[PDB]
Design a binder for this molecule. Structure first.
Ligand SMILES: [Zn+2]
Ligand SMILES: [Zn+2]
Lengths: 81, 92, 105, 96, 79, 90
DNA sequence: TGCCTGGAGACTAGGGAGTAATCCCCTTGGCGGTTAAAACGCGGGGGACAGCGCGTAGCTGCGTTTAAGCGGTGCTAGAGCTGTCTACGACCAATTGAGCGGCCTGCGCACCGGGATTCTC
DNA sequence: GAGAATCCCGGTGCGCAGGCCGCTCAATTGGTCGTAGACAGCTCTAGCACCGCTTAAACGCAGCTACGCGCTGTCCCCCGCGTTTTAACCGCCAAGGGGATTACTCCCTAGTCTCCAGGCA
């Protein structure tokens, strides 16, 4: 597993922008968005892994991600709790 | 009678800066800061205990709350300090 | 950072050089006929048509141009990337970037 | 026939705002999540629900960030979104 | 009409503290409105806290709690 | 020139930029609607002034960033509107 | 400095390991297709960015004007503390029915297919 | 007036939401019994309302010029669309292993109570 940030695809970022209402997109937006998503995922996943490690588990459950997001201030509905 | 962390903050300051004083407003700021971080760590420990269906707050809960709340270098140094304090406490 | 094309650099050099021939920098304190270009265009002066004003202009120097710092005037090993101005030290570079790089303050 | 620039973009804007489907392929996101997690702790298994929750949160975050970026772009009298727009949105949000 | 008590030079001072070089003439009304909204929210929460305690005096702790729940803790008055 | 000197002067200082009595009057006027005959501790009004000035300085900084992004030095009300809209307080 | 309060010292019941069992469920290398999202050209339109010229609105400087600020004083609303005593909530046995899965099946919703209307050029 | 994209009405199939059935465990009911705090009653603090000077800040005008904005003019770079890549994704073929859950037991380890002296406001 290496260089997986390229999995966030240019059409995918374009689709997300279109959902956000963007009409025209510069060519340098894709790298910036990849970096921003990398940072956000790093924070959320670190918190979730801490929660899973506290329970002496080896599987990251959806409840752990929900707790991590709630701690970050981004409470998510529909996945329990 | 009103309780405050002013005495212990002063002792820590004398340990770290023996010749440096502290004003009353700064001491109030320090007391508020200590209370804030205490309440934050305790609240996270409470949430961790409730999520895991545990009736007791132990050192594991406080350590995990510290790791969740404090940023990286601060978190690791605080974890080391807490582990050292607990290890010394159990062996005395 | 942004980069200025050759036309912008040449325009800035020409504007600075022409400003050295200005009579005054301020306006008339009273606040209420031709010019050199009109004279040249009226003379219809052609090159190689015997000695005249245009053919008398001094040619390019043989010795290469020596760089000097745009801020303090001392010799300048460094060239600013954005505008091509010469400079000699980090302090001078900061002063140039704050004062005359890109937008001409 | 050839649509003038901007018409297809608006059409897909309307299409992607009508729907609620996830916009990022699930397998690339799963690999990205596993790649990010292996640094923190090795031998970690992700439930499918956890990956779906992460994807939903990330997509919502990116959509809101793009809304802020588009507002930044309309400010300063533009239509295209540029990295400076994302940077300004993030800085005003309190990130970085 | 005490909102005019926040004088234009005071708004200029606050903007200068924030590193603003030039200020438009319509900023003053906008910042007065913004300050009014912020004060309304904080004071409403503080008065709620004071009423819950059956007190007729808004103590500093009430304002501190209101600010804390608004998302902006304030140090120096809570202890 | 004077603007930069004023920025540095107020940037180094810590005193409250808003006058105390007008702010006290404004606070009491705002609190009048929520409850009648309300008394305020002096520390409460000082805390309100501290919070309000910090909020305004932070907002002005975000609006300055918004103005710089528009290739402008002057701050305009649209900058305040965008700062609050992006921050989420709208 | 005079306390309250944190610290020994004895019981004691239960929370939280250990330890099965137990049930659920893929798990992973290398292979082989095979579509539909990506990826790659590329022509051209239009938006970005750079001037340039106004002209008006912020900024600075000054002379009034104003009220913030400071220091006494003075009076009381009301915050803070204390003593009584009840009403209220914590425990605790017996009931008991409301709320859990287990299991099923109408029916709502997804989808397809022509024809019609609407949108862009 | 052409084309292309939705839209709109029947039909139709599937899987899941809403319902019925046992069963149990956790609300509920009827008790006892400490004690939290609601309510007088007191005290004394600080919040408010008045002055009367000092003077620093706010305000209104004038003069000025700095920059915000509209108007042009490139030109580059991103969009719409066609053609080619490839990588999600299914299938395979293998032998059993995890790895979270639910029940038993059982034993440290907290809580509770008593007494005391010393840490601290
Ligand atoms: Zn130099
Ligand atoms: Zn330069």
């Amino acid at each position: 597993l290496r260089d997986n940030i390229q999995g966030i695809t240019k059409p995918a970022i374009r689709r997300l922008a279109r959902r956000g209402g963007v009409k025209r997109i510069s060519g340098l937006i894709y790298e910036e968005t990849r970096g921003v998503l990398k940072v956000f995922l790093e924070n959320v996943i670190r918190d979730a892994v801490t929660y899973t490690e506290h329970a002496k588990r080896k599987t990251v459950t959806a409840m752990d991600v929900v707790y991590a997001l709630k701690r970050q201030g981004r409470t998510l509905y529909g996945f329990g709790g | 009678r009103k309780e405050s962390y002013a005495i212990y903050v002063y002792k820590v300051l004398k340990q770290v800066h023996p010749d440096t004083g502290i004003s009353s407003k700064a001491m109030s700021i320090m007391n508020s800061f200590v209370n804030d971080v205490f309440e934050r760590i305790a609240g996270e420990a409470s949430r961790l205990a409730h999520y895991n269906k545990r009736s007791t707050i132990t050192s594991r809960e406080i350590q995990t709350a510290v790791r969740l709340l404090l940023p990286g270098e601060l978190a690791k140094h605080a974890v080391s300090e807490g582990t050292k304090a607990v290890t010394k406490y159990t062996s005395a | 950072r942004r980069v200025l094309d050759r036309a912008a650099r040449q325009r800035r050099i020409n504007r600075q050089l022409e400003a050295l021939e200005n009579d005054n920098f301020q306006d008339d304190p009273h606040a209420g006929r031709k010019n050199f270009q009109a004279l040249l265009e009226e003379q219809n002066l052609s090159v190689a048509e015997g000695p005249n004003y245009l053919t008398a202009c001094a040619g390019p120097p043989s010795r290469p141009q020596r760089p000097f710092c745009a801020v303090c005037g001392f010799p300048s090993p460094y060239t600013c990337v954005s505008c091509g101005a010469r400079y000699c030290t980090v302090r001078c570079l900061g002063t140039h970037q704050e004062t005359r790089c890109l937008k001409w303050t | 026939h050839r649509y003038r620039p901007g018409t297809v973009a608006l059409r897909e804007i309307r299409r992607y705002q009508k729907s609620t489907e996830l916009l990022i392929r699930k397998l690339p996101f799963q690999r990205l999540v596993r790649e990010i997690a292996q640094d923190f702790k090795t031998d970690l298994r992700f439930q499918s629900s956890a990956v779906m929750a992460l994807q939903e949160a990330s997509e919502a975050y990116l959509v809101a960030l793009f809304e802020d970026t588009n507002l930044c772009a309309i400010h300063a009298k533009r239509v295209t979104i540029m990295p400076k727009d994302i940077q300004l949105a993030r800085r005003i949000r309190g990130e970085r």
